[PDB]
């Protein structure tokens, strides 16, 4: 289990936008996943992804006087799993020039 | 350790091309990595990736009467690792209309 980001805060609160900020734990991430949605309306979260270098993000296109539930996760993208190799030597037709 | 693909074979041998074929083990892959290079020339492998649905691939742009070392690996792309979420409820300015 990777440690969660810490201290999710808001600033630059307007009628249609919110600046999110957070702090990195003792592990670096490739990305942060930010999920958000109106706390009351029935429906699905909107998913945003930002590079792991980032510590703030501006949410935009929001509604005035409205509560939003915001969740942030650290994301680590593992290297792919490789099998053992299978090898052969194959030779094209004709003669080498 | 994922099991290797099996039975790497060649067909449609021409002066400039080789059809590779192989068999899947008792595990499915997202992709196969195919590395190939002239067996004798000093230099780097060429890396090709094909979807895990595939069981043959045509190597092209080759030299006549030339031996190529070919290696194939199964590739599995894991789901990303997620931290625990950190959540908050934030509220935009103004009044709801």
For chain B, domain boundaries: 1-97
Token readout for A72 is 């942030």
Resolution, angstroms, 1 dp: 1.9
Closest residue in B to A20 (Cα–Cα): B90
A64 DSSP 8-state letter: T
B92 DSSP 8-state letter: -
* A41 interface with B at CB cutoff 8 Å: no
> Phi and psi for B7 in degrees, rounded to 5?
55, 60
Measured in angstroms, the CA of A50 and the nearest CA of chain B are apart by: 14
Token readout for B13 is 């041998």
Burial state string for B39-77 with b = 16 or more CB within 10 A and e = fewer than 16: eeeeeeeeeeebebeeeebebeebeeebebebbbbbbee
Pairwise CB contact (< 8 Å): B89 & A69: yes
* B56 interface with A at CB cutoff 8 Å: no
Nearest to B94 among A4, A65, A89 (CB): A65
* A45 interface with B at CB cutoff 8 Å: no
CA–CA separation, A24 vs A34, rounded Å? 14
Closest to B87 measured CA to CA, from A88, A7, A41, A1: A7
Question: Per DSSP, what are the bridge partners of residue B31?
Answer: B51, B75
Closest residue in B to A32 (Cα–Cα): B82
Q: How many CB pairs under 8 A join A and B?
A: 197
Superfamily of B1-97 according to CATH: Immunoglobulins (2.60.40.10)
**3-class DSSP string for B23-86:** ECCCCCCCEEEEEEEECCCCCCCEEEEEECCCCEEEECCCCCCCEEEEEEEEEECCCCEECCCE
Burial environment of residue B95 by CB neighbours within 10 A (0 to 12, 13 to 18, 19 or more): exposed
């Amino acid at each position: 289990m990777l440690p969660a980001p810490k201290n999710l805060v808001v600033s630059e609160v307007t009628e249609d936008s919110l600046r999110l900020s957070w702090t990195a734990p003792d592990a670096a991430f490739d990305s942060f996943l930010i999920q958000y949605q109106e706390s009351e309306k029935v429906g699905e979260a909107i998913n945003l992804t930002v590079p792991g270098s980032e510590r703030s993000y501006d949410l935009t296109g929001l509604k005035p006087g409205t509560e939003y539930t915001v969740s942030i996760y650290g994301v680590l993208i593992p290297f792919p799993n490789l099998s053992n190799p299978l090898s052969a030597e194959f030779t094209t037709g004709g003669h080498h020039h």
